[PDB]
Curated annotation (Swiss-Prot), chains A, B:
Family from the record: Belongs to the PspA/Vipp/IM30 family.
Intrachain S-S bonds: none
Organism field: Synechocystis sp. (strain ATCC 27184 / PCC 6803 / Kazusa)
Gene, per the UniProt record: vipp1
Function description: Required for thylakoid formation.
Annotated localization: Cell inner membrane
Effect of disrupting the coding gene: Essential, it cannot be completely disrupted. Cells with very low levels of protein have no ordered thylakoids, are barely green and are non-photosynthetic.
The protein's name: Membrane-associated protein Vipp1
Length: 56, 56
């Protein structure tokens, strides 16, 4: 019965850090998707706007 | 007839300690099965939970 209090806390502490890792996963993946889009948009627009205007 | 009272008590005392040893056998075997399972579960879960999370 003393062991089962210890196991019931260890089981709750394990799912608590699994739960934490899952919320972190969503936020980290979101930042990676956003950063991919920011780089492509900024570089593509700046290059095209300089290039077409100068040629014309 | 005095010998047969002595033998009838010795026969009952023998089966009484055989009976005791049999109840003890079941409890000792149960603890050994439980202890085997506790060790494997605790060590396996703790190792896997640390290892997979760190790598990812």
């Amino acid at each position: 019965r003393t062991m089962s209090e210890n196991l019931r806390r260890n089981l709750a502490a394990l799912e608590a850090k699994i739960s934490e890792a899952k919320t972190k996963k969503n936020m980290l993946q979101a930042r990676a998707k956003a950063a991919k889009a920011n780089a492509e948009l900024q570089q593509t627009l700046a290059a095209a706007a300089a290039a077409a205007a100068a040629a014309a």
